[PDB]
Amino acid sequence: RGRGRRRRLVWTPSQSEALRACFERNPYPGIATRERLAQAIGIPEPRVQIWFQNERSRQLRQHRRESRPWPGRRGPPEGRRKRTAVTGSQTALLLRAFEKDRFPGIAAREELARETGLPESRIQIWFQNRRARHP
DNA sequence: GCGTAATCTAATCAACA
DNA sequence: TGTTGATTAGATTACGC
Numbered sequence: 001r002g003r004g005r006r007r008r009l010v011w012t013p014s015q016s017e018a019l020r021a022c023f024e025r026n027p028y029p030g031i032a033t034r035e036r037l038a039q040a041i042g043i044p045e046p047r048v049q050i051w052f053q054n055e056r057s058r059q060l061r062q063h064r065r066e067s068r069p070w071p072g073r074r075g076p077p078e079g080r081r082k083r084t085a086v087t088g089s090q091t092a093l094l095l096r097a098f099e100k101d102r103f104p105g106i107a108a109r110e111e112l113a114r115e116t117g118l119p120e121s122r123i124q125i126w127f128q129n130r131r132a133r134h135p
Numbered sequence: 136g137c138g139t140a141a142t143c144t145a146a147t148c149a150a151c152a
Numbered sequence: 153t154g155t156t157g158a159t160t161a162g163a164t165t166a167c168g169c
Contacts, residue, residue, distance in 0.1 A: 008141065079147080128143075
């Protein structure tokens with residue numbers, strides 16, 4: 001990988017309380033739920049998404065260690081993020097960047113956002129998918 | 136150093152031209 | 153329908169405290 005990752009966030013206690021309470025309600029929130037929590041506690045939705053991935057990993061691993069069944073999905077699955085439209089010039093920017101560095105740090109990713117107008121979070125997924133499809 | 140946010144791979148679901 | 157964006161499980165990495 002590269003270097004220069006995002007500076008880790010530190011949850012305030014109230015933020016932790018809010019994430020844990022949301023998680024009780026449903027450990028598989030949709031984009032509508034994630035954006036709703038994001039705005040309630042004043043952090044960007046992408047940080048919320050990463051915290052649910054990590055909190056599920058922790059719950060699964062504890063359930064596993066306690067030899068307990070994971071409830072899993074409950075209720076109707078909530079809607080996904082709408083698919084991001086990526087123009088041909090946006091794709092071109094990204095492709096050039098990818099040729100020089102497959103593993104951009106937060107620095108590189110945030111300027112691509114400036115340049116392409118795409119969200120940094122979507123750029124990060126773009127590279128994940130590109131790497132996994134173009135060794 | 137600990138705890139865990141941030142990052143990663145791989146497999147898969149699914150939108151859209 | 154094929155391309156590719158979005159999500160998941162789970163492993164790993166590297167920071168703030």
